Amino acid sequence: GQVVADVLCEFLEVAVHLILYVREVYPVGIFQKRKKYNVPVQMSCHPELNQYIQDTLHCVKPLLEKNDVEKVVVVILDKEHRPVEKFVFEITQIDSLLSHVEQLLAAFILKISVCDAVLDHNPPGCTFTVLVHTREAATRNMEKIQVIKDFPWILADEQDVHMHDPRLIPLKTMTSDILKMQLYVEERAHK
């Protein structure tokens, strides 16, 4: 069921672009709307930013193939390179309705699109990064993820990760034969 990796990587790329739209990491003047999941989405048209997102999900896809990823996380960092909010895609993995699962992903997009309602404003000058939490610490994980030259990965320190006393804002959970995933946000207690 490595279709899941192909489906998830498509979805995560779309969800990362939308997350940076909705949280204002980047100017409105680089987004353009496009249709995924027969819901609209708002994707970047900046090449360097698009390359960073595609480079990242190119390296993750094979860890997804073996169900070796517990979480893919989009981290909003503050100007001090400190996490301020985290969008966590928590992942658990033939009556096969692959066609119906892709459309269950639309509800993620609509929840993401309206999530500034239920979240505090971020400090100005935020950037982001991507964390991949593996199910187990395995040599094979890092062998698979270092395939793009000029795009190496490292093991994150507690600084790349740690938020004191965060709040948890659940957004959407799905429960299928082939894809068990939920999206929740962790926001920093304060600014």
Partner: protein
């Protein structure tokens, strides 16, 4: 600059000898811990330690009977080189 407790270098050289010499199949977790130790030396601007750590490990790991320690060394260095290539524009000599 942590390696599983040891800040002082000579202590690191000592945690790494006990580990490589007495244990014939290392857990992947500990190999990853040495890679993170090495990439942290890069962030913290200690290329001399980095060089000395690689040299110490290359001796001990390549001298092992157990072929696992040989492939663990290749793995460690591979993940250090790709960090150096980007952070410094270059590759560590041996």
């Amino acid at each position: 600059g942590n390696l599983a407790g040891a800040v002082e270098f000579n202590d690191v050289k000592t945690l790494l000898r006990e580990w490589i010499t007495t244990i014939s199949d290392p857990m992947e977790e500990d190999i990853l811990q040495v890679v993170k130790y090495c990439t942290d030396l890069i962030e913290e601007k200690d290329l001399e330690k980095l060089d000395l750590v690689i040299k110490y490990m290359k001796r001990l790991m390549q001298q092992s009977v157990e072929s696992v320690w040989n492939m663990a060394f290749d793995f460690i260095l591979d993940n250090v080189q790709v960090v150096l290539q980007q952070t410094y524009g270059s590759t560590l000599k041996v």
